[PDB]
Amino acid sequence: LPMPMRFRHLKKTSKEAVGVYRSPIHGRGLFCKRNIDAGEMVIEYAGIVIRSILTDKREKYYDSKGIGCYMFRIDDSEVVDATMHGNAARFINHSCEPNCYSRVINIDGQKHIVIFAMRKIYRGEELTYDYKFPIEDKLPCNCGAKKCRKFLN
Amino acid sequence: LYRACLYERVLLALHDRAPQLKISDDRLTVVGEKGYSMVRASHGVRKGAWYFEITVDEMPPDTAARLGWSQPLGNLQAPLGYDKFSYSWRSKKGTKFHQSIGKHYSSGYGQGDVLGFYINLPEDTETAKSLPDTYKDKALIKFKSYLYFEEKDFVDKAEKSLKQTPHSEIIFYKNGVNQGVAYKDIFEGVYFPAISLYKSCTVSINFGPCFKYPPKDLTYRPMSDMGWGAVVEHTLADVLYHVETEVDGRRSPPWEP
């Protein structure tokens, strides 16, 4: 099916496909409300599409406001910043064993970061993907996976 | 191989523009859509004094171009003066912008300004006081349907000490009328004329032989002259690199020139 048609279908079904609940991973997180097949569109990380050069000026801005940064790198040139304006995708925890995966798609010239399902996800499951955060010097992970790196970084 | 440039004259190099930067070769004007961006010319100055112009063809209120010079390391997505290696003017009121700092040590700007840009950097002696060797990198690639060359550029300099190039300066003119000195403190490293666009700004760079209010100095050089100078210099660079790798030995005359 066409990536535009699939994206329209995803934006139509997103509000009733997933939910946010109290999470045993941490705080609140994204849970599955209807069995999601593999590779299908789970959710867009929708937000403010900005250029990369403006990230820091925003980040420091949030650093001046004590508001956490909700930014995902679209590519070397664009970023979806969801700190001030976003969607439910801001509540997707991470797991070392993800049933989901992030991919950038091009619809009518604009890039969309869509989390798709790495596998057939069933109702009730908490949605998690690989943030692929670079190794820092340390955030402990509680994803519960047996392969868990003990640290995102 | 060769560094042959897809240009009839020394123009704004397409190799050093942002993907959000549009050009119209009817006037070689440059325009953008969102925020600011930066483009540069084909040539680049290393010594001597020279001069060019920018002609503005459209400046709505939400349209503010910036015009000036910038060394390499200049991120072409930034508004030409956001870093310490770029010095420009904001085309709302004549205001010198460098290190993102705005200074009103300047005249006033007009919507239909044909602005002249004079700039004098010292010889490579006072620039380097050492060897200005130009050992070049050359890598062959075949992008989707055409052949191209890659070279290694300079790295972000952490220079925080002020060592101005001796007797270097920048002067700004409005239609030849002296708008005054913009920056006397000029850091080392080659510079090139650059243009920053805000949302839908229409401006264009222009060389000397078709000028409107040119200075009558016998030492300053138009854009085209330094352009073919640098082109021939890089031709000799290719010559010397292929010599080095291909034939044993090298030799150059009494160093001074």
Curated annotation (Swiss-Prot), chain A:
Q: List the disulfide bonds.
A: none
| Modified residues annotated as S-methylcysteine in this record | 69
Q: What is this protein called?
A: MLL cleavage product C180
The entry's stated outcome for residue 61 to A is:
Affects methyltransferase activity of the enzyme alone, while it does not affect methyltransferase activity in complex
Per its UniProt entry, which superkingdom is the organism in?
A: Eukaryota
Q: Where does Zn(2+) bind?
A: 96, 141, 143, 148
**How changing residue 93 to A affects the protein?**
Loss of the histone H3 methyltransferase activity. Abolishes interaction with S-adenosyl-L-methionine
UniProt binding sites for S-adenosyl-L-methionine: 26, 28, 70, 93-94, 142
Compartments, as annotated in UniProt: Nucleus
Q: Which gene encodes it?
A: KMT2A
Q: Which residues form the SET domain?
A: 16-132
Q: Residue limits of the Post-SET domain? A: 138-153
UniProtKB/Swiss-Prot annotation, chain B:
Query: What does its PTM field state?
Result: Both monomethylated and dimethylated on arginine residues in the C-terminus. Methylation is not required for nuclear localization, nor for MLL complex integrity or maintenance of global histone H3K4me3 levels.
Tell me the tissue specificity.
Answer: Ubiquitously expressed. Predominantly expressed in adult heart and testis and fetal lung and liver, with barely detectable expression in adult lung, liver, kidney, prostate, and peripheral leukocytes.
Keyword Acetylation found = yes
Which UniProt key words apply to this protein? Acetylation, Chromatin regulator, DNA-binding, Metal-binding, Methylation, Nucleus, Phosphoprotein, Transcription, Transcription regulation, Zinc, Zinc-finger
Give the start-end ranges of region Interaction with RBBP5.
1-257
Quick check: keyword Cell membrane in the entry? no
| Record localization | Nucleus
**Annotated B30.2/SPRY domain residues:** 1-212
- Which source organism? Homo sapiens (Human)
Its biological purpose is as follows: Transcriptional regulator. Component or associated component of some histone methyltransferase complexes which regulates transcription through recruitment of those complexes to gene promoters. Component of the Set1/Ash2 histone methyltransferase (HMT) complex, a complex that specifically methylates 'Lys-4' of histone H3, but not if the neighboring 'Lys-9' residue is already methylated. As part of the MLL1/MLL complex it is involved in methylation and dimethylation at 'Lys-4' of histone H3. May play a role in hematopoiesis.
A Gene Ontology BP annotation from the UniProt entry: hemopoiesis
GO CC terms in record: histone methyltransferase complex; MLL1 complex; MLL1/2 complex; MLL3/4 complex; nucleoplasm; nucleus; Set1C/COMPASS complex
The subunit structure is: Interacts with HCFC1. Core component of several methyltransferase-containing complexes including MLL1/MLL, MLL2/3 (also named ASCOM complex) and MLL4/WBP7.
State one molecular function term (GO). Answer: beta-catenin binding
Protein name per its UniProtKB record:
Set1/Ash2 histone methyltransferase complex subunit ASH2
